[PDB]
């Protein structure tokens, strides 16, 4: 009952995607007329936009006023009447279940059964159960079992690593042995920061433009591994290392390394240092304490 | 690069090679007899001779994996060995007996038309196995050439022990068996076609055996006017049957539950126990080394950077004994409920174990139940 | 993390979960756009009175029947006798809204149907609930309507909406003058959804493709920032406090809600939840505490009875955080058609399951300090109808039962004689009587030996037609010794060999060296359970050892004859393909 970490068993789902986006094309085409193939699916899905540190959204202003009803019964069935027969042609080529699916989604009914729920694969079905038990155990705080699941899973030759947050929070709550969550994360960044589609939303990403979740979370969580303190010049040595200039969050990580190292004229230079990086962190999309609070800690230091 | 239009020869070589590979695993790892192999050369020889008594350069052959398992079961059944289809389903779904690949990851590059003729039709899980063994049983004739009587009584034993039924039900069901059949059980259901619509949901012997078994339990328990079987012990039987415990077997049935087509059985993986999952990952690292298809060793060390991570559980006749005892207290209309839930749990186990459908099973036991009422009324 | 070290790595808190408390309340592939059951508390009189928690429940033959009746609350939450109504349409959502406390505790209740859209009023006194039918409109449109929202009757029909008003008490019916549409040819799924936002007199309209805000007493329309690239809008329900919004996408729980007087989106980060299931729905319950204001998110399905729960918190700096996930299960076959909510957590709701007229109250607590089978496919297979098909079954049952008595009394004396000189005589004349018949069948195997067309000699594996000779003995170990010395005797070659032990391996699933230990293990199991377990276990190990008792075709040297000879009639290079010992 959880997402599976495998490419979905194929044929019928793809030919259904065909029927769907093809009919979609015919209806929206005739709709723009009245307002006047993997590749067909491709163009179709294509022409469309593809007090705490909230990476805020884009709110409501500068957006256009209105519309008033476009679609009566007669007018809609006008748009619908013809593209449904065009569909009658290749429906004759697809399978009866697929045809039924086309009939029902085109009535507007939504199918009872998931792609997983109708999938049936023998190595893949076993991997489905494996991954499932991983997610279930991780939900169940069963970090021991869950760890066994994870190791046995990553063993298998089919799994590339979405599963990393599983192991980040996994080894995190594990505390047991193995070179830990931080080690894993900095490994992720060291292996996958160099040249050395379906599956991919944002929580796993490529390093052309922002790889987000895992990077920022090892960043902050490492600054909290300095909350353990009051290793740092290491963390900001390899936060110093990378150029991926649209961060600023590593500027606040940097200035936090200088506030943690500031806890004699050396300590002075560290306090002037954090004073600098807080403004070169006003460079970008701001992470702000009132920051006169930051400075007030810095005057408790100036003591 | 790859062959054209007479890779029939290479096809039949990867196929025959994969067969003898599986035989190696079952004499070796299953302690079969060496005679099996000869019985296999004879059957695979008969149908090889029949597809090379066929002309066309258009191949028209279907050597799917169901044919491998089909001639293995065929040969085993001639030899009267007490192996049944569910043994094969378990064996292959647990990756022990290599199956789910063409020449598994390590071989040969063939025309993608034949790699598809292998990888396709892989599942046995809607009775594809019964249908393919009957199909082979037509392809070369069962009757004179071989002895196609199933190993019935060992299946009864397998079944009583598979529940926790007291040993009287072996003789009960054995008797209803004799009552409708007088113990004559065939293998062909063949009139080469697709087409069928009456008489022939129920003539794979096994499925009828399970049908008699179910029926027997229902009749027997609902008409113990003696009151030999307590209103309670049917519940205690249901609960000792239901308690998910971690033996090799149940762990296996979980592994089969994972690749069974229909819900609920996948909701069944949802309701799984930590030891079952553990022995599962064990069987995963053991029998999914039978997988399919510089930087590689860099990822063996790379993954080996973060850890992959007086004999306890009991044997088969031990479990069988202990539920036979769990009912050993042997010596009012809502007990029909207990009968029903027990029958439906037993059914569930049979459905995953013998790779058929809900609807398939109940079609059969319905038909043959009317086949007992008709020869009783 | 975010605030803990924005201030200047485990959690806030330690690890707590889910428990149940259950009760009965009342009794009555392509799916579509529906959800039909409510309970909410209002009082009509407002001559300085209180609210009454009411249920709008649904009665089905065809789903014609709408039923409204009161709930008296307690720690034991029951009902008092029923009040009723019908409609000729198939009935879809009962909804009874309530504007939040800018104002008042609200009046009466509305429903959407197969044709119609109806709205009822109510008066009540002394345990009766008398309602009045504020008039239907079958349609202007010949269009089914997706959602009603609420004094303002707002309708959505697939891709076009209307703001409307309801008459006052009696007997003029409901009118509209402001309308619109969100039509999208290339979204095939029929469900759209209208629920408004902030109580600002501004609405939200939805389809599985996108989310559109409409400031509807000016002229205003917006498509809020995502669309339909990677997920479908899956559901949305206004987390009860006016300025608060709860939206299920695929793999995300979205907490929209204003943090500005004008309408909003929130990208205050969110949690994600993992399927392809189209059938997911959501609902929130809202608990109050001193330091926070926390919200429990129930995402449920029509496929599996499991409930998927996440929790958020409102420390009104408009602070929101998330703790960790948890999921519970639910019972036999079927799945929720309705989930409805009303140093520990108590959260309580009702569920109705697919195709089960029952309504079950549930409660959930933090710690512990203090199938009725009608599977019509199988019952039709087990209950068979006519009385002569009852006494028929009973007749057969008696036949076999007295037969079993014959077995018991019969074998009993055979058990009396063990290790006797009598059973010795029988094992002798038995063993080599059978040996004589076996030789005869081997001669008639010599006459037909040159068949060379097959390699299965006819009707072989047997006791070979003397059947009484099997049963009469009753000592497994001396019988195993008989068979070992029979195999020994027919060691004269060209004869079958098959080793049983390696096959009992398949029976008990451990190595079964001896034919005896087989009998031991079975006997332990059944001696726990049956009288004369020694008699039966002996009779069944005898039956097994017979059912297997090999005597197949002449042995390995005989098959290779037909092996090569069939490897002859085949054309020449299939013969070249036939290959032993691969690698």
From Swiss-Prot, chain A:
Disulfide bonds: none
Annotated GO MF terms: RNA polymerase I core promoter sequence-specific DNA binding; RNA polymerase I general transcription initiation factor activity; TBP-class protein binding
Keyword Transcription: yes
Keyword terms: Nucleus, Transcription, Transcription regulation
Biological processes annotated in GO: nucleolar large rRNA transcription by RNA polymerase I
GO CC annotation: nucleolus; nucleus; RNA polymerase I core factor complex
Cellular location(s): Nucleus, Nucleolus
Highest rank taxon of the organism: Eukaryota
Keyword field contains Nucleus: yes
Pfam families in the cross-refs: Rrn11 (PF04090)
Anything else known: Present with 476 molecules/cell in log phase SD medium.
PANTHER family: RNA POLYMERASE I-SPECIFIC TRANSCRIPTION INITIATION FACTOR RRN11
Quaternary assembly: Component of the core factor (CF) complex, which consists of RRN6, RRN7 and RRN11. The CF heterotrimer may further dimerize to form a hexamer. RRN11 interacts with RRN6, RRN7 and SPT15.
Protein name in the entry: RNA polymerase I-specific transcription initiation factor RRN11
Organism, scientific name: Saccharomyces cerevisiae (strain ATCC 204508 / S288c) (Baker's yeast)
Name of the gene: RRN11
Curated annotation (Swiss-Prot), chain B:
Protein name: RNA polymerase I-specific transcription initiation factor RRN7
Single GO cellular component term: nucleolus
UniProtKB keywords: DNA-binding, Metal-binding, Nucleus, Transcription, Transcription regulation, Zinc, Zinc-finger
Upper taxonomic lineage: Eukaryota, Fungi, Dikarya, Ascomycota, Saccharomycotina
Compartments where found: Nucleus, Nucleolus
Region (N-terminal cyclin fold) residue spans: 9-113
Role noted for this protein: Component of RNA polymerase I core factor complex (CF) that acts as a SUA7/TFIIB-like factor and plays a key role in multiple steps during transcription initiation such as pre-initiation complex (PIC) assembly and postpolymerase recruitment events in polymerase I (Pol I) transcription. Binds rDNA promoters and plays a role in Pol I recruitment. After binding of UAF (upstream activation factor) to an upstream element of the promoter, CF is recruited in a SPT15/TBP-dependent manner to form a pre-initiation complex.
Interval of the full protein contained in this chain: 94 to 514 of 514
Note: Present with 398 molecules/cell in log phase SD medium.
Description of how the protein assembles with itself and partners: Component of the core factor (CF) complex, which consists of RRN6, RRN7 and RRN11. The CF heterotrimer may further dimerize to form a hexamer. RRN7 interacts with RRN6, RRN11, SPT15 and RRN9.
Gene Ontology BP terms: nucleolar large rRNA transcription by RNA polymerase I
The keyword Zinc-finger is annotated on this UniProt entry: yes
Domain of life the protein comes from: Eukaryota
Organism: Saccharomyces cerevisiae (strain ATCC 204508 / S288c)
Residue ranges of the region described as C-terminal cyclin fold: 114-223
From Swiss-Prot, chain C:
Binding partners and assembly: Component of the core factor (CF) complex, which consists of RRN6, RRN7 and RRN11. The CF heterotrimer may further dimerize to form a hexamer. RRN6 interacts with RRN7, RRN11 and RRN9.
DNA-binding as UniProt keyword: no
Ranges in coiled-coil conformation: none
Pfam families: Rrn6_beta-prop, Rrn6_HB, Rrn6_K-rich
Alphabetical UniProt keywords: Cytoplasm, Nucleus, Transcription, Transcription regulation
GO BP annotation list: nucleolar large rRNA transcription by RNA polymerase I; transcription initiation at RNA polymerase I promoter
Main location, first listed in the record: cytoplasm
Gene Ontology terms for molecular function: RNA polymerase I general transcription initiation factor binding; RNA polymerase I transcription regulatory region sequence-specific DNA binding
Miscellaneous note of the record: Present with 237 molecules/cell in log phase SD medium.
InterPro entries documented for this protein: RNA_pol_I-sp_TIF_RRN6-like, Rrn6, RRN6_beta-prop, RRN6_HB, Rrn6_K-rich
GO cellular component: cytoplasm; nucleus; RNA polymerase I core factor complex
Subcellular localization(s) per the UniProt record: Cytoplasm; Nucleus, Nucleolus
Annotated PANTHER family: RNA POLYMERASE I-SPECIFIC TRANSCRIPTION INITIATION FACTOR RRN6
Transmembrane region(s): none
Protein's name in the database: RNA polymerase I-specific transcription initiation factor RRN6
UniProt entry tagged with the keyword Transcription: yes
Function: Acts as a component of the core factor (CF) complex which is essential for the initiation of rDNA transcription by RNA polymerase I. After binding of UAF (upstream activation factor) to an upstream element of the promoter, CF is recruited in a SPT15/TBP-dependent manner to form a preinitiation complex.
């Amino acid at each position: 009952m959880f997402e599976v970490p495998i490419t979905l068993t194929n044929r019928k789902f793809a030919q259904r995607r065909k029927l769907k986006y093809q009919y979609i094309n015919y209806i929206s085409r005739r709709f723009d007329r009245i307002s006047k193939q993997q590749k067909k699916r491709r163009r179709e899905r294509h022409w469309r936009s593809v007090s705490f540190e909230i990476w805020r959204t884009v709110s409501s202003q500068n957006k256009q006023p209105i519309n008033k009803q476009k679609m009566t019964y007669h007018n809609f069935k006008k748009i619908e009447k013809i593209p449904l027969r065009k569909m009658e042609i290749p429906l004759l080529h697809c399978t009866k279940e697929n045809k039924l699916y086309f009939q029902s989604i085109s009535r507007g009914l939504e199918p009872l059964k998931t792609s997983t729920s109708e999938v049936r694969n023998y190595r893949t079905r076993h991997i489905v159960t494996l991954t499932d038990l991983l997610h279930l155990n991780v939900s169940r705080h069963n970090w021991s079992l869950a760890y066994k699941i994870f190791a046995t899973l990553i063993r298998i030759p089919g799994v590339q690593i979405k599963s990393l947050w599983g192991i980040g929070v996994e080894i995190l709550d594990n505390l047991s042995n193995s070179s830990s969550g931080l080690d894993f994360l900095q490994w992720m960044c060291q292996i996958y920061s160099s040249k050395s589609r379906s599956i991919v939303p944002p929580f796993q990403t490529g390093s052309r433009t922002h790889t987000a979740k895992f990077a920022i979370t090892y960043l902050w969580s490492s600054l909290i591994n300095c909350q353990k303190s009051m290793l740092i010049d290491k963390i900001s040595e390899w936060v110093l290392t990378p150029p991926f200039m649209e961060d600023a969050e590593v500027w606040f990580i940097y200035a936090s390394c200088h506030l943690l190292k500031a806890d004699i004229n050396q300590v002075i230079k560290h306090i002037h240092y954090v004073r600098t990086f807080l403004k070169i962190c006003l460079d970008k999309g701001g992470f702000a304490v009132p920051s006169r609070l930051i400075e007030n800690q810095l005057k408790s230091f100036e003591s | 690069k790859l062959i054209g239009h007479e890779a029939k020869l290479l096809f039949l070589k990867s196929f025959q090679f994969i067969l003898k590979r599986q035989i190696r695993w079952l004499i070796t790892e299953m302690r079969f007899p060496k005679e099996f192999e000869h019985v296999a050369k004879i059957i695979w020889l008969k149908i090889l001779k029949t597809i090379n008594d066929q002309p066309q350069e258009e191949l028209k052959l279907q050597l799917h994996m169901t044919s491998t398992i089909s001639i293995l079961y065929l040969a085993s059944t001639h030899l009267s060995l007490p192996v049944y289809t569910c043994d094969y389903i378990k064996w292959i779904c647990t990756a022990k007996m290599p199956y789910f690949q063409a020449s598994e990851i390590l071989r040969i590059q063939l025309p993608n038309y034949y790699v598809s003729i292998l990888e396709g039709s892989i599942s046995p899980f809607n009775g594809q196995l019964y249908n393919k063994i009957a199909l082979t049983c037509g392809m070369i004739h069962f009757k004179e050439f071989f002895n196609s009587e199933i190993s019935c009584q060992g299946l009864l034993l397998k079944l009583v022990m598979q529940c926790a039924l007291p040993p009287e039900f072996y003789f009960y069901t054995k008797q209803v068996i004799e009552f409708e059949e007088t113990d004559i059980r065939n293998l062909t259901l063949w009139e080469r076609t697709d087409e069928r619509h009456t008489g022939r949901v129920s003539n794979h012997a096994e499925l009828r055996v399970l049908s008699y078994f179910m029926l027997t339990i229902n009749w027997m328990l609902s008409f113990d006017r003696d009151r030999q079987y307590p209103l309670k012990w049917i519940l205690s039987l249901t609960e000792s049957l239901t308690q998910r415990t971690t033996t090799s077997e149940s762990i296996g049935r979980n592994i089969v539950k994972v690749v069974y087509p229909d819900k609920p059985t996948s909701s069944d993986y949802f309701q799984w126990s930590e030891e079952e999952t553990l022995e599962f990952l064990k069987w995963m690292e053991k029998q999914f080394l039978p997988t399919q298809t510089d930087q590689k060793i860099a990822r063996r060390k790379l993954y080996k950077i973060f850890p992959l991570d007086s004999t306890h559980q009991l044997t088969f006749i031990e479990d069988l004994q202990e539920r036979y005892a769990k009912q050993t207290p042997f010596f009012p209309p809502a007990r029909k409920e207990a009968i029903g839930r027990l029958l439906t749990h037993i059914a569930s186990q049979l459905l995953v174990d013998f790779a058929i459908s809900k609807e398939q099973l109940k079609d059969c036991i319905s038909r043959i139940k009317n086949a007992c009422l008709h020869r009783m009324n | 993390v975010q605030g803990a070290s924005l201030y200047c790595t485990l959690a806030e808190d330690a690890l707590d979960l889910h428990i149940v408390v259950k009760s009965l309340l009342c009794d009555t592939s392509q799916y579509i756009q529906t959800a039909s059951d409510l309970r909410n508390y209002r009082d009509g009189t407002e001559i300085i009175a209180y609210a009454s928690g009411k249920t709008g429940s649904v009665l089905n033959i065809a789903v014609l029947t709408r039923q409204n009746t009161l709930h008296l609350n307690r720690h034991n939450n029951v009902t008092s006798i029923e009040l009723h109504s019908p409609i000729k349409s198939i009935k879809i959502p009962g909804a009874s809204e309530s504007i939040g406390r800018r104002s008042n505790l609200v009046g009466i209740i509305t429903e959407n149907s197969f044709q119609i859209f109806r709205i009822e009023s109510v008066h009540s006194r002394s345990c009766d609930v008398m309602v009045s039918s504020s008039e239907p409109l079958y349609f202007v449109e010949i269009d089914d309507l997706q959602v009603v929202d609420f004094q303002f009757a707002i309708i959505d029909i697939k891709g076009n909406w209307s703001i409307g008003r309801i008459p006052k008490n009696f007997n003029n019916q409901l009118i509209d003058n402001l309308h619109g549409t969100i039509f999208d040819p290339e979204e095939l799924s029929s469900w759209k959804r209208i629920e408004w936002f902030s109580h600002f007199q501004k609405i939200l309209v939805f389809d599985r493709s996108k989310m559109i805000e409409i400031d509807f007493m000016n002229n205003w329309q917006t498509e809020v920032v995502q669309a339909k690239a990677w997920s479908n809008i899956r559901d949305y329900k206004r987390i009860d406090d006016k300025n608060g919004i709860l939206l299920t996408s695929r793999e995300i729980i979205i907490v929209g809600a204003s943090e500005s007087n004008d309408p909003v989106r929130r990208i205050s980060w969110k949690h994600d939840l993992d399927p392809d299931d189209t059938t997911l729905r959501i609902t929130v319950q809202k608990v109050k505490k001193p330091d926070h204001i926390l919200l429990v998110a129930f995402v449920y399905s029509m496929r599996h009875k499991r409930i998927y729960m996440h929790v958020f918190s409102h420390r009104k700096a408009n602070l929101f955080q998330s703790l960790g996930c948890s999921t519970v299960l639910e019972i036999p076959g079927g799945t929720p058609t309705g989930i409805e909510t009303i140093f520990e957590l108590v959260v309580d709701f009702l569920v109705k399951l697919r195709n089960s007229s029952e309504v079950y109250y549930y409660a959930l607590s933090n710690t512990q300090n203090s199938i009725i089978v009608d599977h019509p496919e199988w019952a039709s297979l087990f209950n068979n109808a006519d009385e002569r098909e009852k006494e028929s079954i009973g007749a057969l049952v008696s036949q076999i039962k007295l037969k079993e008595r014959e077995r018991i009394s019969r074998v009993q004396n055979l058990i009396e004689h063990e290790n006797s000189h009598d059973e010795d005589k029988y094992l002798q004349d038995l063993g080599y009587r059978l040996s004589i018949a076996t030789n005869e069948l081997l001669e008639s195997w010599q006459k037909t030996k040159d068949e060379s067309i097959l390699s299965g000699s006819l009707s072989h594996s047997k006791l070979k037609n003397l059947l009484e000779n099997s049963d009469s003995f009753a000592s497994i170990p001396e019988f195993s010794s008989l068979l070992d010395q029979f195999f020994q005797y027919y060691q004269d070659q060209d004869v079958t060999f098959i080793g049983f032990e390696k096959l009992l391996h398949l029976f008990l699933h451990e190595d079964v060296p001896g034919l005896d230990i087989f009998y031991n293990k079975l006997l332990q199991c059944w001696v726990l359970v049956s009288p004369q377990a020694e008699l039966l276990t002996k009779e069944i190990v005898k039956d097994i050892i017979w059912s297997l008792a090999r005597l197949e075709k002449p042995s390995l040297f005989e098959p290779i004859q037909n092996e090569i000879s069939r490897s002859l009639s085949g054309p020449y290079q299939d013969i070249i393909s036939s290959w032993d010992m691969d690698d």
